[PDB]
Amino acid sequence: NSNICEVCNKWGRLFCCDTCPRSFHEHCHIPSVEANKNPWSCIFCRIKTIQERCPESQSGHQESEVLMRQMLPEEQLKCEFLLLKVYCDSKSCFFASEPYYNREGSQGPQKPMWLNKVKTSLNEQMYTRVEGFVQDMRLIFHNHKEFYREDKFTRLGIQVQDIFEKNFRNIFAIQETS
Ligand SMILES: [Zn+2]
Ligand SMILES: [Zn+2]
Ligand SMILES: [Zn+2]
Numbered sequence: 001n002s003n004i005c006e007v008c009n010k011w012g013r014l015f016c017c018d019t020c021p022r023s024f025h026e027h028c029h030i031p032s033v034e035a036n037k038n039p040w041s042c043i044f045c046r047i048k049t050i051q052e053r054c055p056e057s058q059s060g061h062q063e064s065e066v067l068m069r070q071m072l073p074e075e076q077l078k079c080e081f082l083l084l085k086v087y088c089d090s091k092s093c094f095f096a097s098e099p100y101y102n103r104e105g106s107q108g109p110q111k112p113m114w115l116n117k118v119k120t121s122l123n124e125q126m127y128t129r130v131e132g133f134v135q136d137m138r139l140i141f142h143n144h145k146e147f148y149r150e151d152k153f154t155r156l157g158i159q160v161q162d163i164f165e166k167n168f169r170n171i172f173a174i175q176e177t178s
Pocket of ligand 1: 005007009010
């Protein structure tokens with residue numbers, strides 16, 4: 001197995017996947033690494049299994065159809081993995097914890113949002129459809145773009161949104177377009 005966490009790329013107290021060489025900190029993995037379970041399979045392995053059990057799940061889909069899916073166990077897992085893929089990028093640090101807004105010439109967002117809040121919301125089964133999760137994720141970056149206006153820091157929002165959207169299209173097998 002790897003000797004660094006797959007998500008944050010640091011050593012420490014790592015839990016190792018039994019079916020692939022990835023390792024994780026307890027709370028870097030999503031869901032948090034399960035207490036018992038020997039063997040244990042990580043989220044990457046669990047997603048690969050879904051795909052292997054239903055190869056047709058990789059044919060293209062319309063985003064509108066994906067968004068209306070109810071959060072049954074497989075869609076719950078897919079959203080957890082997509083959230084994890086965003087945390088895998090180091091620039092996710094800027095969006096993880098609860099933000100505050102005091103900048104001359106800008107007003108804070110009406111509905112603040114951040115990664116750890118989405119993480120809690122998934123953990124507590126607060127989303128009933130994929131749309132709920134995707135909306136909160138997109139709102140993180142939209143809030144950031146609006147607040148930082150012409151400051152070059154706005155680019156961080158664009159960058160992390162691009163990681164989110166690329167992973168969304170991959171995980172949910174959105175039909176490729178120009
Ligand atoms: Zn970690
Ligand atoms: Zn694995
Ligand atoms: Zn099948």
